[PDB]
Write a protein that binds this DNA or RNA. Structure first.
Length: 69
RNA sequence: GGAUUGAAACGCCAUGCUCAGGCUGGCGAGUGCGCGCCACUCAUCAAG
C-alpha cells in the first residue's frame, strides 16, 4: 500500500548512547536516527525527507565488550 | 546527495630456564628319582 519494509541484520552493532559516548555504551535497540542513516545509505535526495514509522526487534538483546586503541 | 552522538582511530615496541648431579654397593636352583614288567611271522604255493 504505502511505506517501506526493510530488514537489516548483522553480527555487530553499536548505537552509542550520547551520555556514555567516550566509553561507548550502545542502546538496546537501534534509534530512529540510525534507521534514517541506513535508509539514506540506500537512496536519498535533497528533494525528499525520510520518516521512520516503526522498528521491529527480531532477536534477543545481547551485549558484548570490545576495547580499542 | 546535508548530517546512522556519525565521520578518523595498532596494544605496541622487547626479554636463555639456566648453571650440575653413579642406582649403587652383593646374593649356588639346590638337594634326589629303573621305562619297566611280557609277546612265533606264521600256517602253503612245479621249473618249464
Amino acid at each position: 500500500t504505502y511505506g517501506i519494509r526493510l530488514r537489516v541484520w548483522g553480527d555487530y552493532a553499536c548505537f552509542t548512547r550520547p551520555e556514555m559516548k567516550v566509553e561507548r555504551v550502545s542502546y538496546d535497540v537501534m534509534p530512529p536516527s540510525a534507521a534514517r542513516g541506513i535508509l539514506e545509505a540506500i537512496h536519498w535526495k535533497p528533494a525528499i525527507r525520510w520518516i521512520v514509522d516503526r522498528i521491529h526487534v527480531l532477536r534477543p538483546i545481547v551485549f558484548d565488550n570490545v576495547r580499542r586503541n
